[PDB]
Amino acid sequence: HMRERYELSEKMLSACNLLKNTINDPKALTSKDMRFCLNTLQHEWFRVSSQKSAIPAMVGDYIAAFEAISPDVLRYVINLADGNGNTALHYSVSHSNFEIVKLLLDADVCNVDHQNKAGYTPIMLAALAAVEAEKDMRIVEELFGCGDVNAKASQAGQTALMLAVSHGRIDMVKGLLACGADVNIQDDEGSTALMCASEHGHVEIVKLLLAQPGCNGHLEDNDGSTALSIALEAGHKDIAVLLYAHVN
Numbered sequence: 001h002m003r004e005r006y007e008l009s010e011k012m013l014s015a016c017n018l019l020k021n022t023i024n025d026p027k028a029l030t031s032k033d034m035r036f037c038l039n040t041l042q043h044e045w046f047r048v049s050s051q052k053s054a055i056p057a058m059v060g061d062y063i064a065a066f067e068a069i070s071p072d073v074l075r076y077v078i079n080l081a082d083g084n085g086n087t088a089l090h091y092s093v094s095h096s097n098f099e100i101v102k103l104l105l106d107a108d109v110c111n112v113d114h115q116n117k118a119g120y121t122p123i124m125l126a127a128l129a130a131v132e133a134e135k136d137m138r139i140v141e142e143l144f145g146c147g148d149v150n151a152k153a154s155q156a157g158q159t160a161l162m163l164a165v166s167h168g169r170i171d172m173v174k175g176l177l178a179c180g181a182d183v184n185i186q187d188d189e190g191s192t193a194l195m196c197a198s199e200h201g202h203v204e205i206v207k208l209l210l211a212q213p214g215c216n217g218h219l220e221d222n223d224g225s226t227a228l229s230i231a232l233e234a235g236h237k238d239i240a241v242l243l244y245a246h247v248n
Contacts, residue, residue: 050091112147119154217247
């Protein structure tokens with residue numbers, strides 16, 4: 001015999017059925033008694049979906065049960081943000097639970113561009129998540145193609161590309177670039193990805209960024225320095241030489 005479905009609790013079921021009849025009534029949603037219902041939804045949803053040991057089969061059975069109740073209900077519950085502004089997407093990306101990440105994307109209702117209170121999008125978090133297999137990297141690529149890869153974080157104005165380059169992650173950089181990441185975006189300090197790669201001596205990353213059409217190696221940070229300036233100050237000569245040739 002094959003596996004057994006995970007069912008919604010009777011409490012969760014009526015919480016969802018109540019939301020179904022109420023979702024399109026702003027006097028009801030914003031009422032105090034309705035918050036008791038929304039808290040129940042939120043509590044059990046994050047329980048099953050946003051823990052390191054969240055079971056993908058359980059998240060899949062929950063997703064499908066929400067759909068069957070209503071697509072409005074599915075949309076509402078998937079996009080719940082906790083007190084930190086974190087959705088299930090944020091959490092399952094950051095915990096490297098990529099099977100769950102795919103289940104969420106396949107529902108086609110996620111707001112992939114929502115930034116938590118710390119200022120980070122799911123794409124940004126993906127650039128920092130561990131990826132141990134090619135199948136997981138494909139799921140991360142699919143996430144990049146769903147949302148805005150060029151969004152700027154609240155902290156320091158950093159993009160996903162800058163975070164990837166900052167930890168020397170060639171795999172992420174290639175994926176981001178393939179999904180139309182803009183290499184010329186500057187952070188609050190005026191720095192680009194190319195300048196970051198140039199400071200840390202990531203030669204291969206520098207080549208990947210210089211190869212992108214429209215790469216502007218003449219840009220300066222707020223101290224007036226270029227990528228070339230920065231490479232030379234850090235003692236990375238081979239990069240400095242590359243930078244000179246491809247800007248001139």
